[PDB]
């Protein structure tokens, strides 16, 4: 059960805005939280934010505090992430990760295939 | 954190549902069935149904209180026992139970061993009393 | 780990499906009228001034009407109340004698007193004379009464009749102080049980309900009795719902639940006089002595435009379950008088209305919008006094006449249809639905479809790290 | 000092009435109603009045026993709690209660706060069990 | 050593019969009378006879539970008390009781003092609560 | 066994009251009877007198 699928790759000119959608299916969407991490090529993953698809409460990272906003949709069970002011160093593979459990997960159960964006 | 109504925390995990035990426990014997009920008035069609409803409410309350007495948990909401957990009834860890399951899902998982566990709890309480009589 | 021990939790929120005894609860405001209503008698405990309805958020529960034991329980109670309220009343054995009936004659002018010209009760009643016993058993008296042709069946020797029931069972006369007004009944549970309520707006009978809530008593359910149309019910929340145990099986009745009420306005324009004779020691029989003044057939008024709209939305939902077929409505094809005509009650007078104008149409393709101006539909209705509503299960009843003019205004909340089968002709892009069907149970599946009785199981066993302190 | 009968100390102050608690407690469930009762004999006029007297005598006993269990006072005549007294229910001193008031007079004085006190007592016992599970 | 059934150890001495207390205690309220019972179905000849049995099964359980509560023994199989044994009820030694008598023989021996012993036990538990209120 | 062959016929004696009667007995007509094995009864009657003595 449960599987997260992201969108296809994008090539966006610097300064534009990019929105990537992770679609969840085959499991109760609202029960488990969703996290976003980015992994630049030849580097390690970086934590970006955590969104609760139940009450919409979100948690962000200071450097991305004023640039990144996370929104969730319930009827079609899709998670959206939009980033603006795309610096040249934002090129990385972006993952959407499901929480391990319904409360105090401390781990990520399922990921997406990744979405490499070039800027 | 907000107070819940009757069975309002049925869909939440155990770790959050166990903070509302007194909500369900406070409604087990007391209800509007014990009113004054506004041709023998106590033999009418709805005079008999009220009567057996009153007896039904008592038996349901005493059916739980019977076990609490046997296990030594009288007068307790959460009662600790001296029976070690057996990793055949279930081998889930702390996080896989209290942060990932609801009380309905769990009681269905161990539904095959509730009768076995009940017998052990009574036997355990009996041993404590035996071990106390010949110790003092 | 080794550090885990068995712990007992009291008050756990867990339940299981169960069947139990539900008792009654009625509002006190409808009480203290001393009218001795049949259904919600004095034995009902007062209702809760502040009912509690608790929304259970992350809960999905399986509901199943057509298998709900609250429906069977309500039918058992409804019949039981009917039989006991008639037990003290007067038996009508002396009225099973030979009746010699002739045409009725009246004195009035009353030039129709209104627009409708349905007809007059003359040719719908007979003037019958017979011999009964006075308070003294060995003395006979000759009396007369006016009977509806539906209540008397000819035997032989033309102009000689008898009551219909005299070869099936004895019928009791409804006691005059008994009231037939349906007042709401709240079904409650014993302590230690609960009722689950489905809050989904568009929810068919069966399947998981994702918006369950907890209650302790049902809402006010009226025991209103009807055959083809559900009256004075509760409207749907989202939209029209078509509920059937299996839409493929044509032996199953289809229940339509309207989201917009349609008014039905029924009246009995005649003016009947109630007169009483003594048929035995302490036994008094109420009869229609005469009908002076207005004389006209009973009728019901329906706004034509509203029904066409309501019949148009319904066919819209039907086309979803029957995609490539045209939907037509037809009058019932036969059966007892309760099936072929809309049967209901109004102030103790039992009506049987035709309702053929309501269910005679065909909706081929909705190719173009057809517009017509407002009209009022008048449905002829017949009155009856020998009543057998429980399909020959309960006690037969005789309804004494009600003095004066009778008027009742009620809502239409649903329709009980019955699709008809076929192999080749019925597959020629057509589906005919005929009103009526099922039984009185379907009149209460439409109210109890959203409820479910469960038993609370407040004893939980879990592993924790707490160990009992030994002395 | 002499032993009293049932409710013989209703008129005495609390300080002296509390020495006769076992007299009232001993008559809460047992009576002559449970006798053999010397045309179904249990459907007669008094065959029913006795049956509903037996159920009544049981609910009256269980109603009090339900609260004792929730508060952790099962099996005790006088039970001490961990709920501080709130000087809004009553601010009388020791001498103004136990030497100047009867149990009937007092229970009327705090009659407005019994329901609030009952809920507090139940919640307090719940915290003791919560604080014990995550302490051992 | 083998497990017994209900009342299987009625003929054995006390020393051996006291190890099978939970066998009898487990069957005091639970039975087949509380089934669904497969012309009001609850007023028939055996509809009434079943209802009376249900109330009888509850009174018998509560009759014993009333005494356990007054003596401070709620939720215990074997409960120790602070009432010294009086050598007028019976002056038999240890071996003359637990190795030579059955529970039926003994309970007939002290049958004249059971009522007196019950009253003393209630009075003793009352003193413990009195001595505790004015000690803390 | 009851070797006869009775016919159940019904008349109406009152409103809703129907009386079932034996209209006729056609075919076999013989008194009802019971069959006992003589030897078995002798034995069963013989052991019993043994206990009575
Ligand atoms: C769907 O729902 C709708 C809405 O809920 C249902 O429609 C409603 O149905 C109810 C009940 O069927 C109707 O209420 C009845 O109204 C009638 C008519 O009221 C008018 O007349 C009153 C005076 O009556 C006198 O004149 C009439 C002729 O006009 C005559 O026929 C009658 O016999 C009598 O001589 C007026 O008072 C009244 O005005 C105002 O009156 C009240 C103040 O007094 C005021 O509060 C009202 O709001 C109103 O504004 C109006 O002009 C009533 O006659 C009838 O009253 C009976 O029932 C009530 C309890 O409901 C009871 O208190 C009354 O005493 C009376 O009960 C007698 O009949 C009972 C049998 O029906 C019997 O059991 C009683 O014992 C009593 O009979 C005894 O006394 C009589 C003498 O009084 C004696 O002859 C007998 O032998 C016996 O001893 C109800 O109130 C609603 O009007 C109606 N609403 C609408 C909009 O249509 C619909 O039916 C439902 N559909 C389905 C399928 O369920
Ligand atoms: C129906 O089902 C849904 C889903 O199953 C369920 O929703 C869960 O509800 C529970 C409530 O019991 C939630 O658990 C709580 O979560 C609170 C929020 O936690 C997040 O935010 C934390 C930081 O928030 C602080 O800062 C922000 C500003 O940034 C501020 O607005 C906040 O108010 C707050 O001050 C963050 O630390 C936290 O991280 C935890 O969780 C992640 C992932 O689970 C984990 O990886 C971390 O290690 C960490 O554990 C999370 O991101 C939280 O505040 C709250 O904590 C209180 O209670 C716990 C109980 O133990 C205490 O320990 C703690 O000290 C606090 O007092 C609690 O953890 C849960 O998150 C919901 N799940 C989802 C998916 O949303 C509904 O309750 C169900 N409803 C019913 C009726 O059944
Ligand atoms: C109906 O209502 C009435 C009125 O409300 C109520 O009557 C009260 O009953 C209580 C019984 O519980 C009485 O309280 C007792 O009083 C006893 C007598 O006290 C007086 O005498 C004391 C000295 O007497 C000794 O010496 C004499 C010889 O001189 C001898 O005959 C005696 O037997 C005894 O040996 C004296 O010390 C005492 O003074 C006390 O009271 C005054 C004023 O109240 C106070 O100012 C003092 O400081 C002192 O406290 C008084 O003058 C008394 O012996 C008895 O004491 C025993 O019990 C207490 C309980 O705590 C123990 O602490 C103590 O050690 C003893 O064991 C007890 O105090 C009370 O006096 C009655 N009130 C009145 C007005 O008469 C009825 O009981 C009610 N009945 C019902 C059925 O409800
Ligand atoms: C119905 O009534 C009958 C009669 O009233 C009753 O029968 C009694 O049943 C009880 C069971 O509870 C018996 O008591 C037990 O007896 C066991 C056998 O004891 C004898 O044998 C001992 C040695 O046997 C060992 O070695 C042999 C090989 O030689 C081997 O096969 C054995 O298995 C065993 O390993 C011997 O030591 C013992 O001596 C005792 O008794 C004598 C006289 O009674 C006394 O003088 C001694 O001082 C000593 O006490 C005896 O000769 C015994 O093993 C068993 O012991 C276990 O339980 C006790 C409980 O306290 C423990 O302390 C102990 O450590 C063991 O775990 C126990 O004592 C009793 O003997 C029966 N009585 C008779 C007359 O046969 C039925 O039970 C009743 N049934 C019902 C349903 O009511
Ligand atoms: C906390 O709880 C959640 C949820 O629990 C579930 O939901 C709740 C509401 C309750 O009802 C619970 O009873 C219920 O279990 C836990 O999430 C589950 O985690 C497990 C373990 O990771 C996971 O099972 C694995 O899924 C892997 C990925 O799924 C893919 O494949 C499946 C194929 O499944 C097929 O078979 C099942 C029945 O066996 C059918 O129902 C299903 O329809 C398929 O026919 C596919 O359906 C998905 O779409 C994905 O494509 C899957 O690869 C694994 O298979 C391997 O399992 C073991 C390893 O565990 C290997 O050894 C085998 O050889 C297999 O290769 C597993 O099937 C569940 O799907 C998760 N459920 C949900 C709803 O997310 C969570 O783990 C808990 N946290 C804890 C315990 O910390
Ligand atoms: C019904 O028939 C009866 C006859 O049994 C009518 O009663 C008589 O009618 C005549 C004609 O006016 C009167 O002269 C008599 O006084 C009436 N009573 C008797 C005892 O004969 C009765 O009028 C008829 N009713 C109707 C409505 O036609
Ligand atoms: C009652 O339900 C019907 C559907 O059965 C509703 O009709 C729909 O109304 C919406 C809003 O205008 C339209 O978009 C749909 O096309 C309509 N459906 C059909 C089949 O005509 C109707 O609005 C509901 N009425 C109320 C008061 O809720
Ligand atoms: C039900 O129909 C009757 C008649 O068919 C209506 O009674 C009329 O009421 C008006 C008042 O607005 C009077 O002016 C008429 O004289 C009445 N008609 C008769 C024949 O008396 C009644 O109003 C209708 N009920 C509703 C709720 O509309
Ligand atoms: C656990 O339970 C099983 C049966 O459910 C039993 O066979 C096993 O012995 C138990 N474990 C221990 C340690 O006794
Ligand atoms: C109706 O019948 C009554 C009773 O006989 C009578 O008093 C009245 O005049 C008749 N006509 C009308 C219009 O009420
Ligand atoms: C209602 O629709 C029918 C067609 O089924 C039509 O004949 C009739 O004139 C319509 N009436 C009104 C008032 O629109
Ligand atoms: C109705 O039949 C046509 C072909 O005759 C088909 O194209 C259409 O999809 C059918 N309608 C539905 C709802 O399947
Ligand atoms: C009415 O019903 C008849 C059959 O009962 C049918 O032939 C006719 O088409 C329907 N419509 C009209 C307007 O009569
Ligand atoms: C005492 O009770 C009142 C309500 O009766 C409440 O407002 C107050 O806070 C309570 N006192 C304390 C110290 O909690
Ligand atoms: C023992 O009981 C008797 C009455 O059965 C009593 O008289 C006696 O005082 C008691 N023994 C003691 C030490 O109190
Ligand atoms: C017995 O009676 C029945 C019923 O009248 C008849 O049909 C049948 O021929 C008779 N004879 C036998 C042998 O059954």
CA distance C258 to C412: 8
Handedness of CA B2, B5, B9, B15 (dihedral sign): positive
| CA C117 – CA C107 distance, rounded (Å) | 19
Query: Where does chain A break, by residue before each gap (C–N > 2.5 Å)?
Result: none
CA of E115 to the centre of ligand 15 (A): 14
Distance CA C344, CA C337 (A): 12
Put simply, whether E82 touches B (Cβ < 8 Å) is no
A114 φ/ψ sector (left φ>0, alpha ψ -120 to 50, else beta):
left
Q: For A9-62, where are the E strands, in sequence order?
A: 10-11, 18-25, 34-39, 45-51, 58-59
- Distance (Å) of CA F47 to CA F37, F38, F43, F53: 16, 15, 6, 10
Phi, psi of B33 (to 5 degrees): -70, -25
Whether B128 and chain D come into contact, CB under 8 Å, resolves to no
Buried b (16+ CB within 10 A) or exposed e, C355-370: bebbbeeebeeeeeee
Contact D78 E130 (CB under 8 A): yes
- Integer Rg of chain E from CA: 20
Alpha carbon separation from B72 to C8, D20, E10, E21, E61 (Å, rounded): 10, 29, 25, 15, 17
Closest CA relative to residue C457, chosen from C155, C15, C110: C15
Pairing of strands C326-329, C430-435: parallel
Place of tokens 């019901």: C300
CB contact under 8 A, B25 and D70: yes
Task: Tell me how the structure was determined.
Answer: cryo-EM
- Helix (H), strand (E), coil (C) string for chain C: CCCCEEEEEECCCCEEECCCCCEEEECCCCCCCCCCECCCCCCCEECCCCCCCEECCCCCEEEECCCCHHHHHHHHHHHHHHHHHHCCCEECHHHCCCEEEEECCCCCCCCCCCCCCCCCCECCEEEEEEEEECCCCCCEEEEEEEEEHHHEEECCCCCCEEEHHHHCCCCEECCCCCECCCCCEEEECCECEEEEEECCCCCCCEEEECCEEEECECCCECCCCCCCEEECCCCCCCCCEEECCCCCCCCCCEEEEEEEEEEEEEEEEEEEEEEEEEEECCEEEEEEEEECCCCCCEEEEEEHHHHHHHHHHHHHHHHHHCCCCEEEECCCCCCCHHHHCEEEEECCEEEEECCCCCCCEEECCCCCCCCCCCCEEEEEEEEECEECCCCCCCCCEECCCCCEEEEEEEEEEEEEEEECCCCCHHHCCEEEEEECCCCCCHHHHCCCCCEEEEEECCEEEEEECCCCCCC
Interstrand relation of C254-280 and C283-291 (parallel, antiparallel or unpaired): antiparallel
* Phi, psi (degrees; rounded to nearest 5) at C47: -75, 165
The neighbours of chain F, by the rule of 3 or more Cβ pairs under 8 Å, are: C
Helix (H) or strand (E) holding F23: strand F17-25
The distance of Cα C92 from the centroid of its chain, to the nearest Å, equals: 26
Q: CA quadruple C177, C178, C181, C182: dihedral positive or negative?
A: positive
Rg (CA), chain F: 21
Helices B45-71 and D45-70: angle between axes, nearest 10 degrees: 40
- Say if CB D46 and CB D54 are below 8 A apart: no
Q: How many helices (H) and strands (E) does chain D have?
A: 6, 0
**Are the CB atoms for C309 and C363 separated by under 8 Å?**
no
State both tokens at A53.
């698809």
Q: Are A78 and A8 in contact (CB under 8 A)?
A: no
Give the resolution value in Å: 2.8
Which residues neighbour A105 within 8 Å (Cβ) at sequence distance 6 or greater?
A32, A33, A99, B99
Q: Torsion-angle region of residue A26: left (phi > 0), alpha (psi -120 to 50) or beta?
A: left
Nearest CA among C396, C393, C402 for reference residue C91: C396
| Neighbouring residues of E93: CB distance < 8 A, sequence distance ≥ 6 | none
Ligand 6 centroid distance, CA of D133 (Å): 92
* Phi (first) and psi of residue C171, to 5 degrees: -120, 135
C85 near C38, Cβ under 8 Å? yes
Cα–Cα distance for residue pair C368/E74, rounded to 1 Å: 81
Contacts of C143 by beta carbon, 8 Å cutoff, 6+ apart:
C129, C130, C131, C132, C277, C287
Helix (H) or strand (E) holding F37: none
Cβ–Cβ below 8 Å for C46 and B38: yes
Task: Specify burial of residue D3 (Cβ count, 10 A radius: 0-12, 13-18, 19+).
Answer: exposed
Rounded to whole angstroms, how far apart are CA atoms B122 and E26? 9
* Nearest ligand atom owner, CA of C113: 8
Residue pointed to by tokens 């039981």: C80
Closest CA to C24 of C58, C74, C66: C74
Alpha helices in chain B (DSSP H): 14-17, 21-25, 45-71, 95-98, 103-109, 114-133
The structure tokens 């129709």 sit at C112
CA E6 distance to own-chain centroid? 15
Contact residues of ligand 6, CB 6 A cut-off: C 104-106, 127, 129, 144, 290
d(CA A35, CA A49): 6
How far lies B69's CA from each of C12, D58, D59, D129, E73, in Å?
18, 18, 19, 17, 10
Pocket perturbation via mutation, ligand 9, pick of B88, B117, B119, B124 by most ligand atoms within 8 A of CB: B88
Q: What is the rounded distance in angstroms from the CA atom of residue A101 to the CA atom of residue B100? A: 5
Nearest to C465, CA basis, from B116, B85, A49: B85
- Residue carrying the six token digits 């300080």: D15
| Token code pair at residue E11 | 């003929």
Chain E contact for D76 (CB, 8 A cutoff): yes
Residues within 6 Å of ligand 1 by CB: C 33, 35, 176-179, 181-182, 224, 231-232, 344-348, 403-404, 408-410
Scan residues 1-53 of F and list those with Cβ closer than 8 Å to C: 12, 15-16
Backbone angles phi, psi at D21, to 5 degrees: -70, -35
∠ CA C164-C169-C171, rounded to 5° = 80
Instruction: Read off the tokens for C138.
Output: 């060995």
Q: How far is CA C141 from the centre of its chain?
A: 40
- The answer to whether B25 contacts chain C (CB < 8 Å) is yes
- The answer to whether C464 touches D133, Cβ cutoff 8 Å, is yes
State the first-to-last Cα distance of chain F, in angstroms, to the nearest integer: 35
Q: Identify the DSSP state of D136.
A: -
Q: Which residues of B touch E19 (CB under 8 A)?
A: 130
> Which of C6, C38, C196 to probe by mutation at the B interface, max B CB count within 10 Å?
C6
Cα dist from E132 to D81, E74, F40, whole Å: 12, 19, 82
Q: How many CB atoms lie within 10 A of CB B79?
A: 23
- Name which of C195, C186, C205 is nearest C20 in CA terms: C195
Asked if C464 and C1 touch (Cβ cutoff 8 Å), the reply is: no
Inspect the interface and report whether the beta carbons of D136 and C465 lie closer than 8 Å.
Answer: yes
Strand, helix or coil for residue A118: strand
D14 contact residues in E (CB cutoff 8 A): none
Contact C101, C128 (CB under 8 A): yes
Q: Which residue of B has its CA nearest to C82?
A: B45
Contact D70, D121 (CB under 8 A): yes
Q: Which residue in this structure is represented by tokens 């954190």?
A: B1
Nearest to B13 among A100, A102, A106 (CB): A102
* Strand duo A3-5 + A18-25: pairing: antiparallel
Q: Give the integer Cα–Cα distance in Å for A87 and C100.
A: 106
Non-local CB neighbours of A106 within 8 Å, separated by 6+ positions: A100, B95
R_g of chain B computed on alpha carbons: 20
Handedness of CA B76, B80, B81, B86 (dihedral sign): positive
Cα separation of C213 and C192, whole Å? 17
Ligand 12 centroid, distance to C324 Cα (angstroms): 6
Contacts of B95 in chain A (CB under 8 A): 100-101, 104, 106
CB C445 within 8 A of CB C71: yes
Q: What's the token pair of residue C114?
A: 């209104």
- The C-alpha atoms of residue D102 and residue E57 are separated, in whole angstroms, by 39
CB-based contacts of D56, cutoff 8 Å, min separation 6 = none
| Rg of chain D over all Cα atoms, to the nearest angstrom | 20
Q: How far is CA C346 from CA C119, C180, C415, E123, in A?
A: 21, 8, 19, 69
User: Distance (Å, rounded) from C-alpha C169 to C-alpha C394?
Assistant: 11
Q: Which of residues 93-132 of B touch C (CB under 8 A)?
A: 97, 102-104, 106-107, 110, 114, 117, 120-121, 128, 132
Give the β-pairing of A58-59 and C404-419. unpaired
Choose among C467, C445, C462: nearest CA to C71.
C445
Contact F16 C93 (CB under 8 A): no
Q: Which residues contact D81 (CB under 8 A, 6 or more apart)?
A: D71, D72, D73, D121, D124
Spatial contact of C26 and C185, defined as CB atoms under 8 Å apart: yes
The answer to whether the CB of A59 is under 6 A from ligand 2 is yes
Is the Cβ atom of B12 under 6 angstroms away from ligand 2?
A: yes
Nearest ligand 15 atom to the CA of E116 is 5
Of C297, C150, C328, C310, the closest CA to residue C230 belongs to C310
**Residue nearest atom 19 in ligand 8 by C-alpha distance:** C114
Q: How many residues does chain D have?
A: 136
d(CA C244, CA A76): 29
| CB C303 near ligand 11, within 6 Å | no
Q: What is the 3-state secondary structure (H, E, C) of C415-458?
A: EEEEECCCCCHHHCCEEEEEECCCCCCHHHHCCCCCEEEEEECC
Backbone angles phi and psi of C54, in degrees to 5: -105, 125
Going by C-alpha positions, the residue among B67, B72, B74, B82 that lies closest to residue B118 is: B67
Q: Which of C229, C98, C220, C72 is nearest to C159 (CA)?
A: C98
Tokens of C437: 């069907």
- Residue A22, Cα to own-chain centre: how many angstroms? 7
Give dist(CA A108, CA A100) in Å, integer. 5
Closest CA to C418 of C406, C435, C401, C403: C435
Rounded to the nearest 5 percent, the helix, strand and coil shares of chain B are 55, 5, 40
User: From the CA of A103, how many Å to the nearest CA of chain B?
Assistant: 5
For residues B124 and B117, give the distance between their C-alpha atoms in angstroms, rounded to a whole number. 10
């Amino acid at each position: 059960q449960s599987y997260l699928v992201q969108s296809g790759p994008e090539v966006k000119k610097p300064g534009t805005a990019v929105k990537v959608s992770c679609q969840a299916s085959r499991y109760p969407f609202t029960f488990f939280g969703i996290s976003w991490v980015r992994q630049a090529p030849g580097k390690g993953p970086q934590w970006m934010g955590w969104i609760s698809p139940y009450n919409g409460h979100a948690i962000y990272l200071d450097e991305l505090k004023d640039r990144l906003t996370l929104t969730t949709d319930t009827d079609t069970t899709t998670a959206y992430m939009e980033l603006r002011n795309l610096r040249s160093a934002d090129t990385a593979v972006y993952f959407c990760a499901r929480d391990h459990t319904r409360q105090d997960s401390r781990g990520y159960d399922f990921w997406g295939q990744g979405t490499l964006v070039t800027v | 954190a907000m107070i819940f109504g009757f069975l309002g925390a049925a869909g939440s995990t155990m770790g959050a549902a166990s903070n509302t035990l007194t909500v369900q426990a406070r409604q087990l014997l007391s209800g509007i069935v014990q009113q004054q009920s506004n041709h023998l008035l106590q033999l009418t069609v709805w005079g008999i149904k009220q009567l057996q409803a009153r007896v039904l409410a008592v038996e349901r309350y005493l059916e739980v209180q019977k076990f609490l007495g046997l296990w030594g948990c009288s007068g307790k909401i959460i009662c600790c026992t001296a029976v070690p957990w057996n990793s055949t009834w279930s081998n889930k860890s702390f996080e896989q139970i209290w942060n990932n399951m609801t009380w309905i899902e769990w009681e269905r998982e161990i539904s095959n061993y509730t009768s076995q566990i009940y017998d052990i709890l009574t036997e355990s309480q009996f041993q404590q009393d035996i071990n106390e009589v010949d110790l003092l | 780990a080794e550090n885990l021990w068995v712990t007992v939790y009291y008050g756990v929120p867990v339940w299981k499906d169960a069947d139990t005894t539900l008792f009654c609860a009625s509002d006190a405001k409808a009480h203290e009228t001393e009218a001795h209503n049949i259904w919600a008698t004095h034995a009902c405990v007062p209702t809760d001034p502040n009912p509690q309805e608790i929304y259970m958020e992350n809960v999905t529960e399986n509901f199943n009407m057509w298998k709900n034991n609250m429906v069977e329980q309500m039918q058992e109670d409804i019949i039981s109340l009917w039989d006991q309220s008639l037990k003290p009343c007067v038996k009508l054995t002396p009225l099973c004698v030979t009746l010699s009936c002739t045409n009725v004659t009246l004195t009035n002018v009353n030039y129709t007193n209104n627009f409708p010209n349905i007809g007059n009760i003359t040719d719908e009643v007979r003037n019958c004379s017979f011999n009964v016993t006075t308070e003294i058993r060995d003395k006979k008296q000759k009396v007369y009464a006016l009977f509806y042709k539906l209540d008397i069946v000819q035997m032989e020797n033309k102009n000689s009749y008898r009551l219909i029931n005299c070869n099936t069972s004895v019928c009791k006369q409804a006691c005059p102080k008994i009231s037939f007004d349906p007042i709401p009944i709240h079904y409650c549970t014993p302590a230690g049980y609960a009722i689950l309520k489905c809050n989904e707006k568009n929810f068919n009978g069966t399947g998981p309900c994702k918006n369950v809530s907890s209650v302790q008593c049902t809402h006010g359910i009226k025991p209103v009795v009807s055959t083809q149309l559900l009256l004075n019910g509760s409207l749907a929340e989202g939209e029209i719902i078509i509920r059937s145990e299996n839409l493929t099986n044509n032996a199953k009745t289809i229940i339509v639940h309207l989201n917009k009420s349609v008014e039905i306005n029924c009246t009995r324009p005649s003016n009947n006089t109630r007169t009483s004779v003594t048929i035995g020691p302490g036994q008094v029989f109420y009869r229609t002595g005469d009908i002076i003044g207005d004389i006209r057939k009973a009728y019901c008024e329906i706004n034509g435009t509203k029904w066409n709209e309501t019949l148009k939305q319904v066919v819209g939902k039907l086309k979803e379950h029957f995609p490539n077929k045209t939907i037509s409505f037809q009058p019932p094809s036969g059966g007892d008088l309760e099936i072929t005509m809309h049967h209901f009650n109004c102030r103790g007078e039992f009506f049987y209305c035709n309702t053929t104008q309501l269910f005679n149409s065909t909706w081929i393709n909705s190719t173009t919008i057809k517009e017509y101006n407002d009209t009022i539909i008048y449905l002829p209705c017949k009155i009856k006094q020998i009543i057998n509503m429980w399909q020959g299960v309960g006690q037969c009843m005789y309804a004494p006449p009600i003095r004066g003019k009778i008027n009742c205004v009620s809502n239409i909340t649903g329709i009980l249809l019955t699709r008809d089968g076929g192999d080749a002709n019925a597959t020629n892009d057509t589906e005919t639905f005929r009103p009526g069907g099922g039984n009185i149970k379907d009149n209460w599946r439409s109210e109890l479809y959203k409820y479910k009785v469960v038993q609370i199981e407040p004893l939980g066993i879990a592993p924790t790290k707490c160990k009992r302190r030994v002395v």
